[PDB]
Design a protein around this nucleic acid. Structure first.
Ligand code: MG
Ligand code: MG
Ligand code: MG
Ligand code: MG
Ligand code: MG
Ligand code: MG
Ligand code: ZN
Lengths: 733, 733
DNA sequence: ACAACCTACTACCTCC
DNA sequence: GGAGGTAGTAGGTTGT
DNA sequence: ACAACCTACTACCTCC
DNA sequence: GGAGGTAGTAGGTTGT
C-alpha cells in the first residue's frame, strides 16, 4: 500500500522568491474603467482584497491615480494561495510563460492538419507549494483552429453554403476575423421553414461592408497588403449571413456578416468518421507519451536557463486495494442476503443468469412496497417514422424480447407485477411534426385513465433538433410516464452470436435502467459512516435566461435512500443555505424526524462560498446541528502518471483516483479534495482530512444506479445532485 | 348618448409638415458605440428600420462614417406612427420642447417645499393624427427632488444616520451627485444583525475620497468654487456607506460612498402623516385645475409664437348608460335565479341581510360540488406577538365573530360545511423569528393529517420585512392553506355604532374574500359574447434574476370559468405562442374538448410583438382556429376631462372610461384599445373596432371577485392573468 | 495575458 | 438519445 | 433629449 | 397586508 508515482511538477530555484512585499490601496471607482486586476498585473503584483482595492506588489507602485501605502509585510506572512500567485507572476516576469513554453514545445510536436483544421500543442502552468518548496505544474493540451474561411471552405457556391448552414444547425458558430476584437456569432434560421436567413442579391451592401472593413481596421500600407493577402478580392456574388452575438446581452442586436470575413469554430461534428477517429486518437495522449514530451521540454528549458533545478517529481502515494464486493449486498435464492464476493461474481455479471444456467441466480434486494400493489403497468412502444422499415421491426421485436425476458425471469422467483404490452400501445409517428405529438399526448392521456404508472420505450433517429427530445420527455413526464430512449445508431450495433438481437452489453444496461427508473434497488452497501445525513449540492444555468436555477440537494439519509430537494432560484452561483436548511428541517419534520443535535456532511460540487459559510454558521447556531463541509474539484492542471486506485497527499489537499480507465488512450484525471470545515454552534474551524474520510469518499464513489459497468468518479450524492439539477433545468417534472 | 368633452390636445399649424423626406442606410457595427438612435436624433430624423439601420431625415445627411442613399419618398407615404414621430422631432427643433414648456409653466405654478423635498411642475408631450390634422398632446405632471444631502439631513450625527438607514430598510436609495454621471445606489445591511454596514473611523479614506472627487470631476476655478459651495468643507468625522449599484449587472461590485456626496431618492415613506396628506392632495389635480393651467399655458404659448393655432380641443364621445344589474345573476329564497335590478339592490349591498331583516336575503349562485362533500374545514388563527395585548384580543374576537356570523347566516338557507374553530388552532408567535415559523409549519402539518382544505386568518403588524410575508404565505400554501392577512392599521379602524367591532366596509370585504378564495361564485353574468374562449395574457419579472417568468394565461372558457395556465419561462417580454397553444390544445384534449374550428379572443396586457404574431399565424395555419387579438394600454399621455362612463374614437384607437372615480381628487385615466387583428389560416388582417367589441370589453370590466365595491379598469381575464403571474413570480404554489 | 473554477454542447472507446 | 470515462469549442462566477 | 410602453416599490381616499 | 382607484421613484424591453 505504498507506490512511487511521477507527476508533472518541477522544483524551482529558491532565489526567485521575493524578500518583502508592499500593500497598496487604490482609490478609484469601478464605473470609469481599467479594471483593478489589469492594474495589479501591470505593476507585477496581485490583488489581495478586491472590495477594498488592496494589492500586493514586490516593488513600489508606478500608478498615475490615487494610492496610499498600507503595509510592508514579509513574504512568509501571506497565505499560501497569494504566495503561489505571486510566484506565478514572478515566473511570468522571468520568461517562464505559457506562450514561450508552447513555442518551445512546437519544436518537438509540429502542427498537424486534420481536414480543414490545424492542431497546435499548448502548455498550461500553475504553482504549488509543498514541503516548504515551490513547484511549477505543467499541463499538456492542444488547440484546434480553422485555416480556411467559410467562403473558401464551401468552395465559393451559394448552394453549398446553404447546405452547410442547414446541416450543422444548432452546433455552428462563426468568428469574425476581419475586426480588431474577435466576436463569436450564431446564425439565424427561420423559426418554421428551418432555413438559414440570408440576403441573396444585395451586392451594393456587400461592397459597402467590404470597404467599411477595409478603411476602418486595416488602414496602413503593410496592414492593407496583409488584409488583401488574407482575404483577397471582394466577391460581389456572395450572400450576407444575418447573425447575433453569442454574448447573452447583445442577442437583441442583429449583425450582417459577409461569409468571407468569418471562420467556423471547431466542433467535432464538422469531420467525417475517419478524421474524427484520427483526431481523437491524436489528442488523447497516454502517460508515457506525456512523460517523454515533458522530459524533452524540461531538458530544453534547463539547458537554457537556471530557474528549474529538477525534473518530473516523484512523490509517495497510498494505494487502495480493498475488496468492495464484501460491502455490496444482494439477495439470492428466495430472500437470502449475501455479498457479491461470496458468489464469485462481480457487479457486472448480475444479469447473465437470465439465459445461462451455469451461473447462479441473483435476485434484487429491496423492491418498494409501492411497486407491489399495482396490478398492471401499461407499456408503450413509440417508433419514429423516419427509420428504414427494418430498424422499426428490429426496435419493436427487441423491446418485446426485453420486456418478455424481464417478466419471465423475475416472476419465477420474486413477486413482480404485469408489464402488459398490447398491440394498442404501439405508435409510429413523425417526431418532428407538432400535430402528431399533440395527438399522441391526447391518446396517451385517454389510455392511462385507470392507471398510476406507465413505461414507454421510444426509438428515435440518429439526430433530433434537441428540443423535440426535451418536449417529448416533458409531455410523457407530465402524465406519469417513465421513458427509455434508444436511437438508431445503438440499434445498428450488432452482436456476434446472432444478428437478430441487440448487443448483450446494451441489453443488460437497458434492463438495469428500466429497473432503476421503476424504483428497484438491485444492490446496496454494508458500511456505516459516522454521519446521519450526507447532502450533495450542485448548480446549473437556466436554459435561455441570465438566471441560475442552480438548486439541487440530494440528502442520502437512510447507504440507501436517495430523496432530492429543490433549493430554489438564484442569480449567480451561491446557494442560500438559510432557506435551504429551513426547508431541510421542515421536510423531515413532516416525516417525523427531529433535525437537531445530528451531524450532517455536505459535499458541494465546486467550492463553498462565503455566503454559504455564513448561512451554515447561522443555521448551526440556531437549530443546533454540527456541519461538516468538503470541497470537491474535478478540473485542475495536476496529473498523476499511473493507472490504479490511490490517493496523494499534496500540500493541503488530497488527490484521489477512485477509478481505473478502461480505454487504451488517455490519462486519468484525479479528483481534488480540499478545505474540510467543521461548523459547531456558529463557529467555523478548519480540520485535517483523515484516512477515514478518504475511505468514505471512495466508498461513496461506488454504488451507481445507471449502469452495471460504471466506474464513475464523483461520489453518489454529488452525481445524483447533478442529475437532479439536469432534470430541473430542462423542465422534466 | 352623445356628449361634448374636452381633451388636452391643441391643433398645430399645417406649414410645419415637411414636403419630402430622404431614407438613408448606415453601415456600422453595434460593438463600437454611438447608438443609431442618437445619430438619427442628431441629424433631425427618425429610425425606420433598426435592423437594416435605415433612418428617415427631412434633409441631407451630415454623417462622418459610411452611408448610402436609399429612397426619396413623400411624407404622406409613411405610416402614421413615423409621421407622428417626425412631427414631434420637428416641433422639438422649432422650440416646442418639454423643457421650455415646463419652464414657462413654472411662472404659474411655483416650486413648493414639502419637508426636505421640492416639487416642481413638468409637462410631457406627444403628437396625434386625427381627421388629417396633427395635434399636440400636453400632459401635466410633477417632479420631486431632495434639496439637502444625507449628512445635512441627519444633522451631522452618526447615530442619526444609523437610525435613518435602519428605519427605512428596503425602501432607501442614494444618488451620488458629486460625479459626472449620476448612479442610484442601494446600501448594504448585515444579513442577520439587521444593521447598516458602515466604516466607523477611517478618516484617511474619507479625506482620500474627498480629494479624489475634488481633483477629478471639479477641476476648474468656477467648478471648484461651485463644488465648495454645494458640498462645503470635508467632515473627517463621518462614516462611509458601503453600497451597490441598482443596475442588475454591477451588483457584484461594492462601492464606498461618503454620506455627504449623495442625496436620498424620494419615497413617500420619508414623510410624516400631515406632509404625506398635503403632498398627495397637491400632486393629484382635478379636471378644472388642469383645464385652467393648460389654458393659461396655451395662451402664453400662442402669444409668443404662431405654431399653435387652437386651444383645448372638443371632441365627440358616446356615453355608456346601460343597466348592468340586468346582466348580473344571483339566487334568493332557496335557489331562485334572479337579477340584482329586480331586487332593488346593487352589487355592494349583498351582505346587509346578515344583520338587518329589512333588506332581502341574497344567497350565492353556484357552490362547487367539491366544496360540498367536505365534512369539516379546519380554521386557524395566527396572531403576531408584537401587538399591544389589545389588538390581539380584538383580532381574535373579530375573526371569531366573522366566522360565526358567516356560518350561522349560510347554514340556515343553503347547504354549507362546518368551519370548525378550536382553541387548539390559535397561535401567537413572533413572525420575524425563524425558529417559530418552522415550529408553526410542523404543527400545522401534524394537525392537518386527516384533512384536505384549511383556512388561516393571520393578524400581523404595521410593517413586515416583505420577505417574511411571502415566506409565511408560501409555507401555508405548500400544505393547502388559504390565508387571509389583516394588518394592525386595518384593525385600528373603528366603526361608528360600537367600537367593539370592525368597520362594516372591511367586514363585508373580508367575507367576500373568504368566499372567493374558498371557490364560491356569489354572482355571474348573463350575456353571450361571440367567442367560445377568451384568453388574457400578462408578463412579470422574476424576483432577483435577469429572466422573466412572464407567463400567465387566463382562459375564461365557460361568463364564468376562470382556469389559468402557466406559459413557461422567457428571457424578455415575448410570449411563445407556439408552445403555449400546444399546451392549450393538450389541456382541453385531456378534458375532452376539441380546440379546432373555434374562435379565440386574445387580450394581451401591453402590445403584441412580431414573434407572437408569427406564432399565432402558424398555430392558426396548423390547428385551424380563428384568432382575434386586441392591444390594451393603460398608461398614455391623453386625458379626457370628464367623469362618466364613455368611449372616444380617436385616430385608429378607442379610449374607454369603464369606471367612475369615487375620490374628490384626481383625473381618471382612460384605457386605450388599439390594433385589432384577425388571424385565419395563417393570414393576418387588420379590422375595425365595432361597437359590439367595446360593449363586450366594458362588460368584461365588471364581475370582480375580490371586492364588492370594486370599480376596476381592466377586463377580468387581463386582471386575473396579472394576479396569476403575481402568484407565480413570488413562488406561491 | 486575472487565476481557478464551473456550465452548455461535441465526438470515440469499453463493458458480464 | 446504453452510460461512464477522456478530448476539444464558446461562455459565466468568485475572489475579500 | 430615442418614444412608447411595461415592471417593482410607495403613499392616501372611498365603499352597502 | 380589505381592495380598487390615482400620485411619485428607480429600472428594463421593443421597435423592423
Ligand atoms: Mg438517461
Ligand atoms: Mg457545480
Ligand atoms: Mg454539476
Ligand atoms: Mg404586461
Ligand atoms: Mg402585469
Ligand atoms: Mg390580498
Ligand atoms: Zn443579464
Amino acid at each position: 500500500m505504498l507506490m512511487k508515482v511521477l507527476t508533472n511538477m518541477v522544483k524551482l530555484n529558491q532565489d526567485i522568491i521575493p524578500n518583502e512585499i508592499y500593500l497598496y490601496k487604490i482609490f478609484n471607482k469601478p464605473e470609469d474603467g481599467m479594471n483593478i486586476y489589469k492594474i495589479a498585473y501591470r505593476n507585477h503584483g496581485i490583488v489581495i482584497d478586491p472590495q477594498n482595492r488592496i494589492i500586493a506588489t514586490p516593488s513600489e507602485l508606478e500608478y498615475s491615480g490615487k494610492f496610499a501605502i498600507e503595509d510592508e509585510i514579509s513574504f512568509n506572512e501571506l497565505p499560501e494561495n497569494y504566495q503561489n500567485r505571486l510566484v506565478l507572476r514572478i515566473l511570468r516576469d522571468n520568461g517562464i510563460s505559457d506562450h514561450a513554453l508552447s513555442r518551445t514545445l512546437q519544436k518537438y510536436r509540429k502542427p498537424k492538419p486534420f481536414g480543414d483544421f490545424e492542431v497546435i500543442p499548448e502548455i498550461r502552468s500553475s504553482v504549488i507549494k509543498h514541503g516548504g518548496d515551490f513547484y511549477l505544474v505543467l499541463h499538456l493540451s492542444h488547440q484546434i483552429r480553422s485555416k480556411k474561411t467559410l467562403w473558401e471552405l464551401v468552395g465559393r457556391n451559394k448552394d453549398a453554403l446553404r447546405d452547410f448552414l442547414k446541416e450543422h444547425r444548432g452546433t455552428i458558430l462563426l468568428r469574425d476575423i476581419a475586426s480588431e476584437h474577435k466576436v463569436v456569432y450564431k446564425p439565424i434560421f427561420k423559426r418554421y421553414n428551418g432555413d438559414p436567413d440570408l440576403i441573396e442579391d444585395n451586392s451594393n451592401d456587400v461592397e459597402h461592408w467590404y470597404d467599411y472593413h477595409l478603411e476602418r481596421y486595416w488602414n496602413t500600407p503593410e496592414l492593407k497588403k496583409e488584409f488583401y493577402k488574407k482575404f483577397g478580392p471582394v466577391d460581389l456574388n456572395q450572400p450576407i449571413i444575418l447573425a447575433k452575438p453569442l454574448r447573452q446581452h447583445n442577442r437583441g442586436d442583429l449583425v450582417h456578416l459577409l461569409p468571407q470575413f468569418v471562420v467556423p469554430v471547431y466542433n467535432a461534428e464538422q469531420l467525417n468518421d475517419i478524421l474524427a477517429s484520427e483526431i481523437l486518437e491524436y489528442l488523447k495522449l497516454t502517460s508515457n507519451q506525456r512523460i517523454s514530451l515533458l522530459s524533452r521540454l524540461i531538458n530544453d528549458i534547463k539547458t537554457n536557463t537556471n530557474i528549474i533545478v529538477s525534473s518530473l517529481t516523484e512523490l509517495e502515494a497510498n494505494t487502495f486495494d480493498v475488496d468492495l464486493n464484501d460491502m455490496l449486498q444482494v439477495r439470492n435464492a428466495d430472500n437470502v442476503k449475501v455479498t457479491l464476493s461470496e458468489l464469485e461474481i462481480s457487479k457486472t455479471r448480475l444479469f447473465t443468469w437470465m439465459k445461462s444456467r451455469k451461473y447462479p441466480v441473483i435476485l434484487p434486494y429491496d423492491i418498494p412496497q409501492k411497486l407491489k400493489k399495482i396490478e398492471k403497468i401499461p407499456v408503450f412502444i413509440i417508433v419514429d417514422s423516419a427509420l428504414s422499415r427494418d430498424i422499426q421491426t428490429f426496435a419493436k421485436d427487441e423491446f418485446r424480447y426485453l420486456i418478455s425476458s424481464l417478466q419471465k425471469s423475475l416472476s419465477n422467483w420474486v413477486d413482480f407485477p404485469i408489464l402488459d404490452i398490447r398491440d394498442k400501445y404501439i405508435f409510429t409517428i413523425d417526431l418532428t411534426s407538432d400535430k402528431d405529438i399533440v395527438n399522441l399526448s391526447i391518446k396517451l392521456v385517454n389510455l392511462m385513465k385507470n392507471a398510476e404508472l406507465g413505461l414507454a420505450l421510444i426509438a428515435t433517429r440518429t439526430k433530433l433538433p434537441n428540443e423535440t427530445f426535451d418536449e417529448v420527455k416533458k409531455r410523457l413526464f407530465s402524465v406519469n410516464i417513465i421513458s427509455q430512449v434508444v436511437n438508431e445508431a445503438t440499434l445498428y450495433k450488432r452482436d456476434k452470436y446472432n444478428e437478430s438481437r441487440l448487443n448483450l452489453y446494451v441489453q443488460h444496461n437497458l434492463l438495469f435502467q428500466i429497473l432503476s427508473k421503476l424504483g428497484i434497488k438491485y444492490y446496496v452497501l454494508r458500511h456505516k459512516f459516522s454521519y446521519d445525513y450526507i447532502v450533495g449540492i450542485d448548480v446549473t444555468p437556466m436554459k435561455l435566461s441570465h438566471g441560475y436555477i442552480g438548486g439541487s440537494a440530494v440528502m442520502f439519509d437512510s447507504i440507501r435512500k436517495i430523496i432530492p430537494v429543490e433549493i430554489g432560484e438564484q442569480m449567480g452561483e451561491s446557494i442560500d443555505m438559510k432557506e435551504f436548511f429551513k426547508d431541510m428541517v421542515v421536510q423531515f419534520g413532516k416525516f417525523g424526524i427531529d433535525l437537531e443535535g445530528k451531524s450532517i456532511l455536505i459535499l458541494r460540487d465546486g467550492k463553498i462560498t462565503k455566503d454559504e459559510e455564513e448561512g451554515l454558521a447561522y443555521i448551526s447556531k440556531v437549530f443546533g446541528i454540527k456541519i461538516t463541509t468538503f470541497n470537491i474539484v474535478k478540473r485542475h492542471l495536476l496529473r498523476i502518471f499511473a493507472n490504479r486506485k490511490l490517493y496523494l497527499r499534496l500540500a493541503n489537499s488530497v488527490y484521489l483516483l477512485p477509478h481505473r480507465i478502461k480505454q487504451s488512450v488517455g490519462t486519468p484525471v484525479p479528483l481534488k479534495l480540499s478545505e474540510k470545515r467543521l461548523i459547531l454552534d456558529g463557529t467555523i474551524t478548519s480540520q485535517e482530512i483523515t484516512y477515514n474520510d478518504i475511505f468514505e469518499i471512495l466508498l461513496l464513489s461506488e454504488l451507481n444506479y445507471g449502469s452495471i459497468s460504471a466506474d464513475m468518479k464523483l461520489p453518489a450524492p454529488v452525481h445524483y445532485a447533478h442529475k437532479f439539477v439536469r432534470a430541473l433545468r430542462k423542465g422534466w417534472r
